[PDB]
Enzyme design. Structure first.
Site, PDB file in Angstrom:
ATOM      1  N   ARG A   1      -3.763   8.479  -7.068  1.00 22.05           N
ATOM      2  CA  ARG A   1      -4.175   8.265  -5.633  1.00 22.05           C
ATOM      3  C   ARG A   1      -4.554   9.580  -5.007  1.00 22.05           C
ATOM      4  O   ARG A   1      -4.011  10.648  -5.349  1.00 22.05           O
ATOM      5  CB  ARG A   1      -3.077   7.643  -4.758  1.00 22.05           C
ATOM      6  CG  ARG A   1      -2.652   6.208  -5.086  1.00 22.05           C
ATOM      7  CD  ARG A   1      -1.464   5.910  -4.207  1.00 22.05           C
ATOM      8  NE  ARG A   1      -0.771   4.621  -4.339  1.00 22.05           N
ATOM      9  CZ  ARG A   1      -0.256   4.114  -5.468  1.00 22.05           C
ATOM     10  NH1 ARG A   1      -0.401   4.713  -6.661  1.00 22.05           N
ATOM     11  NH2 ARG A   1       0.396   2.952  -5.410  1.00 22.05           N
ATOM     12  N   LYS A   9      -4.309   7.895   2.680  1.00 19.11           N
ATOM     13  CA  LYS A   9      -4.878   7.543   1.406  1.00 19.11           C
ATOM     14  C   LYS A   9      -6.411   7.306   1.552  1.00 19.11           C
ATOM     15  O   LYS A   9      -6.874   6.563   2.447  1.00 19.11           O
ATOM     16  CB  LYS A   9      -4.204   6.323   0.803  1.00 19.11           C
ATOM     17  CG  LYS A   9      -4.647   6.071  -0.595  1.00 19.11           C
ATOM     18  CD  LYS A   9      -3.872   4.929  -1.192  1.00 19.11           C
ATOM     19  CE  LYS A   9      -4.509   3.562  -0.949  1.00 19.11           C
ATOM     20  NZ  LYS A   9      -3.798   2.444  -1.737  1.00 19.11           N
ATOM     21  N   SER A  30      -6.067 -11.695  -2.118  1.00 17.76           N
ATOM     22  CA  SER A  30      -4.990 -10.709  -2.132  1.00 17.76           C
ATOM     23  C   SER A  30      -4.183 -10.764  -3.430  1.00 17.76           C
ATOM     24  O   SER A  30      -3.893 -11.841  -3.933  1.00 17.76           O
ATOM     25  CB  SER A  30      -4.098 -10.978  -0.908  1.00 17.76           C
ATOM     26  OG  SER A  30      -2.859 -10.352  -1.073  1.00 17.76           O
ATOM     27  N   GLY A  41     -11.874  -3.459  -2.629  1.00 17.26           N
ATOM     28  CA  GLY A  41     -11.925  -2.042  -2.418  1.00 17.26           C
ATOM     29  C   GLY A  41     -10.659  -1.432  -2.917  1.00 17.26           C
ATOM     30  O   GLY A  41      -9.743  -2.168  -3.254  1.00 17.26           O
ATOM     31  N   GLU A  60     -14.357  -3.866 -10.489  1.00 18.57           N
ATOM     32  CA  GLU A  60     -13.015  -4.181 -11.010  1.00 18.57           C
ATOM     33  C   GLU A  60     -12.409  -5.429 -10.343  1.00 18.57           C
ATOM     34  O   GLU A  60     -11.793  -6.279 -11.001  1.00 18.57           O
ATOM     35  CB  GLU A  60     -12.094  -2.979 -10.772  1.00 18.57           C
ATOM     36  CG  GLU A  60     -12.478  -1.680 -11.473  1.00 18.57           C
ATOM     37  CD  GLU A  60     -11.601  -0.473 -11.009  1.00 18.57           C
ATOM     38  OE1 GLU A  60     -11.732   0.585 -11.683  1.00 18.57           O
ATOM     39  OE2 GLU A  60     -10.793  -0.568 -10.017  1.00 18.57           O
ATOM     40  N   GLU A  61     -12.496  -5.481  -9.023  1.00 22.79           N
ATOM     41  CA  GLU A  61     -11.774  -6.492  -8.237  1.00 22.79           C
ATOM     42  C   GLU A  61     -12.532  -7.818  -8.094  1.00 22.79           C
ATOM     43  O   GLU A  61     -11.932  -8.869  -8.023  1.00 22.79           O
ATOM     44  CB  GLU A  61     -11.418  -5.952  -6.847  1.00 22.79           C
ATOM     45  CG  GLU A  61     -10.534  -4.741  -6.924  1.00 22.79           C
ATOM     46  CD  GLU A  61      -9.839  -4.415  -5.610  1.00 22.79           C
ATOM     47  OE1 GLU A  61     -10.098  -5.086  -4.563  1.00 22.79           O
ATOM     48  OE2 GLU A  61      -9.016  -3.501  -5.676  1.00 22.79           O
ATOM     49  N   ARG A  80      -0.926   1.412   7.801  1.00 22.69           N
ATOM     50  CA  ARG A  80      -0.776   1.598   6.375  1.00 22.69           C
ATOM     51  C   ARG A  80      -1.219   2.994   5.919  1.00 22.69           C
ATOM     52  O   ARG A  80      -1.037   3.345   4.770  1.00 22.69           O
ATOM     53  CB  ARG A  80      -1.586   0.551   5.635  1.00 22.69           C
ATOM     54  CG  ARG A  80      -1.246  -0.862   6.058  1.00 22.69           C
ATOM     55  CD  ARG A  80       0.257  -1.090   6.102  1.00 22.69           C
ATOM     56  NE  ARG A  80       0.892  -0.968   4.791  1.00 22.69           N
ATOM     57  CZ  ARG A  80       2.214  -0.920   4.565  1.00 22.69           C
ATOM     58  NH1 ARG A  80       3.104  -0.974   5.568  1.00 22.69           N
ATOM     59  NH2 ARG A  80       2.656  -0.822   3.309  1.00 22.69           N
ATOM     60  N   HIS A  82      -4.216   4.614   5.696  1.00 21.05           N
ATOM     61  CA  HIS A  82      -5.355   4.802   4.803  1.00 21.05           C
ATOM     62  C   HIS A  82      -6.660   4.741   5.513  1.00 21.05           C
ATOM     63  O   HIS A  82      -6.774   4.240   6.635  1.00 21.05           O
ATOM     64  CB  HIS A  82      -5.365   3.886   3.562  1.00 21.05           C
ATOM     65  CG  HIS A  82      -5.278   2.417   3.851  1.00 21.05           C
ATOM     66  ND1 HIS A  82      -6.270   1.699   4.504  1.00 21.05           N
ATOM     67  CD2 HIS A  82      -4.351   1.514   3.456  1.00 21.05           C
ATOM     68  CE1 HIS A  82      -5.892   0.425   4.568  1.00 21.05           C
ATOM     69  NE2 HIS A  82      -4.731   0.290   3.939  1.00 21.05           N
ATOM     70  N   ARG A 106      -7.294 -12.820 -10.103  1.00 21.34           N
ATOM     71  CA  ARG A 106      -7.900 -12.705  -8.764  1.00 21.34           C
ATOM     72  C   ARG A 106      -9.120 -13.616  -8.655  1.00 21.34           C
ATOM     73  O   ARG A 106      -9.951 -13.664  -9.598  1.00 21.34           O
ATOM     74  CB  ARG A 106      -8.301 -11.264  -8.446  1.00 21.34           C
ATOM     75  CG  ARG A 106      -8.279 -11.008  -6.969  1.00 21.34           C
ATOM     76  CD  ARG A 106      -8.942  -9.770  -6.529  1.00 21.34           C
ATOM     77  NE  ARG A 106      -8.335  -8.519  -6.966  1.00 21.34           N
ATOM     78  CZ  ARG A 106      -7.506  -7.780  -6.224  1.00 21.34           C
ATOM     79  NH1 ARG A 106      -7.004  -8.229  -5.065  1.00 21.34           N
ATOM     80  NH2 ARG A 106      -7.099  -6.601  -6.692  1.00 21.34           N
TER      81      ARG A 106
HETATM   82  O1  LIG Z   1       0.925  -3.638   1.773  1.00 27.93           O
HETATM   83  P1  LIG Z   1       0.268  -4.679   0.953  1.00 27.93           P
HETATM   84  O2  LIG Z   1       0.106  -6.085   1.716  1.00 27.93           O
HETATM   85  O3  LIG Z   1       1.046  -4.974  -0.426  1.00 27.93           O
HETATM   86  O4  LIG Z   1      -1.236  -4.278   0.542  1.00 27.93           O
HETATM   87  C1  LIG Z   1      -1.522  -3.757  -0.753  1.00 27.93           C
HETATM   88  C2  LIG Z   1      -1.454  -2.233  -0.647  1.00 27.93           C
HETATM   89  O5  LIG Z   1      -2.007  -1.836   0.604  1.00 27.93           O
HETATM   90  P2  LIG Z   1      -1.221  -0.779   1.530  1.00 27.93           P
HETATM   91  O6  LIG Z   1      -1.810   0.661   1.112  1.00 27.93           O
HETATM   92  O7  LIG Z   1      -1.385  -1.093   2.959  1.00 27.93           O
HETATM   93  O8  LIG Z   1       0.307  -0.781   1.040  1.00 27.93           O
HETATM   94  C3  LIG Z   1      -2.185  -1.528  -1.786  1.00 27.93           C
HETATM   95  O9  LIG Z   1      -2.184  -0.119  -1.560  1.00 27.93           O
HETATM   96  P3  LIG Z   1      -1.102   0.807  -2.314  1.00 27.93           P
HETATM   97  O10 LIG Z   1       0.290   0.330  -2.132  1.00 27.93           O
HETATM   98  O11 LIG Z   1      -1.552   0.827  -3.859  1.00 27.93           O
HETATM   99  O12 LIG Z   1      -1.352   2.295  -1.746  1.00 27.93           O
HETATM  100  C4  LIG Z   1      -3.620  -2.032  -1.956  1.00 27.93           C
HETATM  101  O13 LIG Z   1      -4.175  -1.331  -3.063  1.00 27.93           O
HETATM  102  P4  LIG Z   1      -5.612  -0.602  -3.029  1.00 27.93           P
HETATM  103  O14 LIG Z   1      -5.601   0.391  -1.769  1.00 27.93           O
HETATM  104  O15 LIG Z   1      -5.846   0.135  -4.282  1.00 27.93           O
HETATM  105  O16 LIG Z   1      -6.713  -1.733  -2.725  1.00 27.93           O
HETATM  106  C5  LIG Z   1      -3.511  -3.501  -2.348  1.00 27.93           C
HETATM  107  O17 LIG Z   1      -4.804  -4.023  -2.679  1.00 27.93           O
HETATM  108  P5  LIG Z   1      -5.230  -4.444  -4.181  1.00 27.93           P
HETATM  109  O18 LIG Z   1      -3.898  -4.548  -5.072  1.00 27.93           O
HETATM  110  O19 LIG Z   1      -5.997  -5.706  -4.166  1.00 27.93           O
HETATM  111  O20 LIG Z   1      -6.085  -3.216  -4.764  1.00 27.93           O
HETATM  112  C6  LIG Z   1      -2.892  -4.295  -1.190  1.00 27.93           C
HETATM  113  O21 LIG Z   1      -2.686  -5.639  -1.622  1.00 27.93           O
HETATM  114  P6  LIG Z   1      -3.649  -6.843  -1.162  1.00 27.93           P
HETATM  115  O22 LIG Z   1      -4.567  -7.269  -2.257  1.00 27.93           O
HETATM  116  O23 LIG Z   1      -2.674  -8.031  -0.693  1.00 27.93           O
HETATM  117  O24 LIG Z   1      -4.421  -6.342   0.157  1.00 27.93           O
HETATM  118  F   LIG Z   2      -7.615  -1.234  -5.377  1.00 26.21           F
HETATM  119  F   LIG Z   3      -9.517  -2.468  -8.881  1.00 37.85           F
HETATM  120  F   LIG Z   4      -7.567  -0.309  -7.954  1.00 31.65           F
HETATM  121  F   LIG Z   5      -8.226  -4.506  -2.942  1.00 31.14           F
HETATM  122  F   LIG Z   6      -7.014  -2.773   6.069  1.00 42.41           F
HETATM  123  F   LIG Z   7      -6.922  -3.118  -7.527  1.00 40.25           F
HETATM  124  F   LIG Z   8      -8.970   1.153  -9.828  1.00 40.52           F
HETATM  125 MG   LIG Z   9      -8.515  -1.917  -7.050  1.00 44.65          MG
HETATM  126 MG   LIG Z  10      -6.190  -0.064  -5.979  1.00 44.00          MG
HETATM  127 MG   LIG Z  11      -7.855  -2.650  -4.038  1.00 41.09          MG
HETATM  128 MG   LIG Z  12      -8.154   1.488  -7.985  1.00 41.89          MG
END
Ligand SMILES: O=P(O)(O)O[C@H]1[C@H](OP(=O)(O)O)[C@@H](OP(=O)(O)O)[C@H](OP(=O)(O)O)[C@@H](OP(=O)(O)O)[C@H]1OP(=O)(O)O
Ligand SMILES: [F-]
Ligand SMILES: [F-]
Ligand SMILES: [F-]
Ligand SMILES: [F-]
Ligand SMILES: [F-]
Ligand SMILES: [F-]
Ligand SMILES: [F-]
Ligand SMILES: [Mg+2]
Ligand SMILES: [Mg+2]
Ligand SMILES: [Mg+2]
Ligand SMILES: [Mg+2]
Ligand SMILES: [Cl-]
Ligand SMILES: [F-]
Ligand SMILES: [F-]
Ligand SMILES: [F-]
Length: 132
Positions: A1, A9, A30, A41, A60-61, A80, A82, A106
């Site tokens: 990260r 972030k 999600s 993203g 990827e997603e 959050r 970011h 997904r």
């Molecule tokens: O708090 P959450 O509801 O579990 O959201 C998470 C989390 O977002 P936050 O940064 O707000 O905690 C992840 O971020 P990290 O914990 O890895 O820093 C983010 O990951 P990405 O920034 O890489 O997108 C992920 O999204 P995803 O796993 O689809 O990549 C997302 O979960 P959601 O898919 O429910 O939004």
């Molecule tokens: F991601």
């Molecule tokens: F991804």
């Molecule tokens: F990712």
């Molecule tokens: F995402």
């Molecule tokens: F967001």
């Molecule tokens: F991801």
């Molecule tokens: F990734």
């Molecule tokens: Mg991703």
């Molecule tokens: Mg990610």
């Molecule tokens: Mg993501």
């Molecule tokens: Mg990633």
């Protein structure tokens, strides 16, 4: 990260539109809560250009590729901590069996812009604002 100088972030995302008319956009489910929708993203890698990260994370997603358009803006989620570069992507290739489909099951779905804004609002208001 990776992180900006203030500890936020670094992320990138695309508004993946069906066409140049930008009427239908592709959301993905999600990972935590599969009954919810998000804009695909994720995190920028070290030294990775934001446009490159955007396209890579959408691949990827969401399992799509296309023609990269304009930077919409840079969006903070204060809660959050970011900060996300958001680009327009005009989808030209829809792949079956993409990374997250295979790995986490997904889902993806096309939404009229109005409806995208609606389903994003509750849990992802900053993402809804991407479309303003
Ligand atoms: O708090 P959450 O509801 O579990 O959201 C998470 C989390 O977002 P936050 O940064 O707000 O905690 C992840 O971020 P990290 O914990 O890895 O820093 C983010 O990951 P990405 O920034 O890489 O997108 C992920 O999204 P995803 O796993 O689809 O990549 C997302 O979960 P959601 O898919 O429910 O939004
Ligand atoms: F991601
Ligand atoms: F991804
Ligand atoms: F990712
Ligand atoms: F995402
Ligand atoms: F967001
Ligand atoms: F991801
Ligand atoms: F990734
Ligand atoms: Mg991703
Ligand atoms: Mg990610
Ligand atoms: Mg993501
Ligand atoms: Mg990633
Ligand atoms: Cl469209
Ligand atoms: F990520
Ligand atoms: F990443
Ligand atoms: F990642």
């Amino acid at each position: 990260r990776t992180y900006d100088g203030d500890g936020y972030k670094k992320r990138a995302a695309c508004l993946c539109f069906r066409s140049e008319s930008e009427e239908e956009v592709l959301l993905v489910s999600s990972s935590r809560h599969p009954d919810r929708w998000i804009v695909p993203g994720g995190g920028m890698e070290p030294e990775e250009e934001p446009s490159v990260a955007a396209v890579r994370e959408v691949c990827e997603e969401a399992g799509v590729k296309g023609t990269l358009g304009r930077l919409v803006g840079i969006f903070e989620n204060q809660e959050r901590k970011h900060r996300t570069y958001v680009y327009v992507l005009i989808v030209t290739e829809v792949l079956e069996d993409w990374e997250d489909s295979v790995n986490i099951g997904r889902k993806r779905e096309w939404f009229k812009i109005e409806d995208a804004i609606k389903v994003l609002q509750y849990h992802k208001p900053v993402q809804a604002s991407y479309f303003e």
